């Protein structure tokens, strides 16, 4: 049984900006251990629907190790053995007494800490969970780890020019619909919701997003849902049956339906809220010591004043280093500012890359210029409520751009023929 000062449950984005936090905090070789149940030390997830698909020049681990997706060092295993940060990978927790402050492994073994970080990140909700027919075929696949990833990239080489489905209309099936394509798939995108990304587009913004994939090629069929899959005799997956009748021939499904938070391990021993571990402006949950970063916290949401839970990238390393920071601010028991985070979302698939900054209530407004056909489209939306912008959306955007959007929607600044040179308001903000 191994017993840590500091223990971070989790080997993902947020355990592994914890760790570069420690470590600019004073953290002593011995002290601080990460539990996972990957093979390998943390890495900058988004990679995995992005460049992890090229078909040439791959981003591949060790590349993307955390923190180069934010600019940072790269966090080798070596640099974790260098510093006496111990990495127990392989190594999944079955169980959590946050009583007794003890961990035990799928294999019998025991862990204990007096700080625990909890950075157990979302499920990947399967087909399979919902007991749909057929849905353990080979070739439905998820992604949300590299060994998925991997299963993937092995999918696509064996299945050479063949037939992707690509069930769902979030941010998996935006990306992997764009990377299926550029691998030389027929591809074909299956979703209920009215358009993509349901959600934070608005019906101007998906109508861009919708046509521009047309263009490149890509099927889209709307207003349902698989409800079974065929397979040979091999147990290989050859077609999609959908809710409505029709049948999509598929060498390769993938599926992007959804993830939610990793938290039945303290089912009962922490307090929660609109589906997450429950916390303060320091990440600390219901138990003292005990911590919960990433997208299982619902934390409070200063700007907002609201709780909220986000699963995004931005969020799980800024969350990791509050918490690092508030742990060692109660050591030397000085005082830390609490949380106040700016929502920034975004995507990139083809040549296309957008951000959302702020809040997404009220009424919208579109500018700039929407064609597909554009040579760089650059367009982009203001939401409005009560005479105030609470939220920015830019595609095609320069860094200074994009800078001006976040200064929108971190000011809130009053407004109304916005509509205007609409960019050129953000940028003389
Ligand atoms: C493929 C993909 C692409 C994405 N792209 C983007 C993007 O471009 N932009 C963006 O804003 N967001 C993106 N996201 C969202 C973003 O990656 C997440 O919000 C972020 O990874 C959350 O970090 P985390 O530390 O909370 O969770 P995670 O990084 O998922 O880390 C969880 C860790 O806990 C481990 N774990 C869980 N339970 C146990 C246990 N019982 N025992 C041991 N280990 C355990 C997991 O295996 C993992 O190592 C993407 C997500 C995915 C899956
Ligand atoms: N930020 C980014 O650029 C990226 C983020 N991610 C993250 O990874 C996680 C998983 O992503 P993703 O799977 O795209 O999840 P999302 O929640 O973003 O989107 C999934 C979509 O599928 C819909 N849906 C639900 N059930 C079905 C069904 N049976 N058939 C078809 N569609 C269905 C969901 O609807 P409903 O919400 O109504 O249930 C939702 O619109 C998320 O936490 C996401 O934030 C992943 C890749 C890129």
């Given at each position: 049984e191994?017993?840590?000062?500091?223990?971070?449950?989790?080997?993902?984005?947020a355990?592994?900006?914890?760790?570069?936090?420690?470590?600019?905090?004073?953290?002593?070789?011995?002290?601080?251990?990460?539990?996972?149940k990957?093979?390998?030390?943390?890495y900058?997830?988004?990679?995995?629907?992005?460049?992890?698909?090229?078909?040439?020049?791959?981003?591949?681990?060790?590349?993307?190790?955390?923190?180069?997706?934010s600019?940072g060092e790269?966090?080798?295993?070596?640099w974790?053995?260098?510093?006496?940060?111990?990495?127990?990978?392989?190594?999944?927790?079955?169980?959590?007494?946050?009583?007794?402050?003890?961990?035990?492994?799928?294999?019998?073994?025991?862990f204990?800490?007096?700080?625990?970080?909890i950075?157990?990140?979302?499920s990947?909700?399967?087909?399979?969970?919902?007991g749909?027919?057929?849905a353990?075929?080979?070739?439905?696949?998820?992604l949300?780890?590299?060994?998925?990833?991997?299963?993937?990239?092995?999918?696509?080489?064996?299945?050479?020019?063949?037939?992707?489905?690509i069930?769902?209309?979030?941010?998996?099936?935006?990306?992997?619909?764009?990377?299926?394509?550029?691998?030389d798939?027929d591809?074909?995108m299956?979703?209920?919701?009215?358009?993509?990304?349901?959600?934070?587009?608005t019906?101007?913004?998906?109508?861009?997003?919708?046509?521009?994939?047309?263009?490149?090629?890509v099927?889209?069929?709307?207003?349902?849902?698989?409800?079974?899959?065929?397979?040979?005799?091999?147990?290989?997956?050859?077609?999609?049956?959908?809710?409505?009748?029709?049948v999509?021939?598929?060498?390769?499904?993938?599926?992007?339906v959804?993830?939610?938070?990793?938290?039945t391990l303290?089912?009962?021993?922490?307090?929660?809220?609109?589906?997450?571990?429950?916390?303060?402006?320091?990440?600390?949950?219901?138990?003292?010591?005990?911590?919960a970063?990433?997208?299982?916290?619902?934390f409070?949401?200063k700007?907002?004043?609201?709780?909220?839970?986000?699963?995004?990238?931005?969020?799980?390393?800024?969350?990791?280093?509050?918490?690092?920071?508030?742990?060692?601010?109660?050591?030397?028991?000085?005082?830390?500012?609490?949380?106040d985070?700016?929502?920034?979302?975004?995507?990139?698939?083809?040549?296309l890359?957008?951000?959302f900054?702020?809040?997404?209530?009220?009424?919208t407004?579109?500018?700039?210029?929407?064609?597909?056909?554009?040579?760089?489209?650059?367009f982009?939306?203001?939401?409005i409520?009560?005479?105030?912008?609470?939220?920015?959306?830019?595609?095609?955007?320069?860094?200074?751009?994009?800078?001006?959007?976040?200064?929108?929607?971190?000011?809130?600044?009053?407004?109304?023929?916005?509509?205007?040179?609409?960019?050129?308001?953000?940028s003389?903000?």
């Open positions: 191994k017993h840590f000062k500091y223990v971070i449950l989790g080997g993902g984005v355990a592994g900006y914890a760790a570069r936090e420690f470590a600019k905090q004073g953290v002593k070789p011995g002290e601080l251990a990460i539990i996972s990957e093979a390998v030390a943390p900058e997830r988004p990679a995995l629907s992005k460049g992890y698909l090229f078909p040439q020049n791959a981003a591949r681990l060790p590349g993307f190790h955390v923190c180069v997706g600019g790269r966090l080798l295993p070596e974790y053995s260098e510093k006496g940060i111990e990495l127990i990978l392989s190594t999944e927790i079955v169980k959590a007494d946050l009583a007794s402050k003890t961990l035990t492994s799928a294999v019998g073994a025991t204990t800490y007096e700080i625990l970080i950075a157990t990140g979302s990947v909700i399967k087909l399979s969970d919902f749909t027919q057929g353990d075929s080979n070739n439905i696949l998820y949300r780890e590299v060994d998925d990833a991997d299963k993937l990239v092995a999918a696509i080489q064996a299945k050479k020019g063949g037939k992707a489905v069930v769902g209309g979030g941010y998996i099936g935006l990306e992997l619909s764009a990377a299926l394509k550029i691998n798939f591809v074909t299956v979703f209920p919701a009215p358009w993509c990304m349901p959600r934070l587009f019906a101007d913004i998906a109508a861009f997003y919708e046509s521009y994939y047309t263009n490149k090629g099927k889209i069929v709307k207003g349902t849902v698989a409800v079974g899959f065929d397979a040979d005799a091999n147990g290989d997956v050859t077609a999609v049956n959908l809710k409505n009748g029709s999509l021939e598929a060498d390769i499904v993938v599926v992007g959804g993830g939610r938070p990793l938290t303290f089912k009962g021993q922490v307090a929660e809220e609109k589906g997450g571990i429950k916390t303060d402006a320091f990440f600390e949950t219901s138990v003292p010591g005990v911590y970063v990433g997208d299982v916290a619902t409070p949401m700007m907002y004043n609201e709780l909220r839970r986000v699963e995004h990238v931005d969020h799980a390393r800024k969350s990791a280093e509050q918490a690092v920071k508030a742990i060692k601010g109660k050591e030397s028991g000085e005082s830390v500012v609490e949380y985070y700016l929502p920034y979302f975004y995507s990139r698939s083809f040549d890359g957008w951000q900054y702020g809040d997404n209530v009220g009424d407004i579109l500018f700039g210029d929407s064609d597909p056909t554009s040579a760089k489209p650059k982009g939306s203001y939401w409520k009560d005479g105030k912008v609470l939220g920015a959306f830019l595609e095609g955007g320069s860094p200074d751009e994009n800078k001006a959007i976040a200064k929108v929607a971190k000011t809130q600044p009053p407004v109304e023929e916005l509509k205007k040179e609409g960019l050129q308001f953000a003389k903000i």
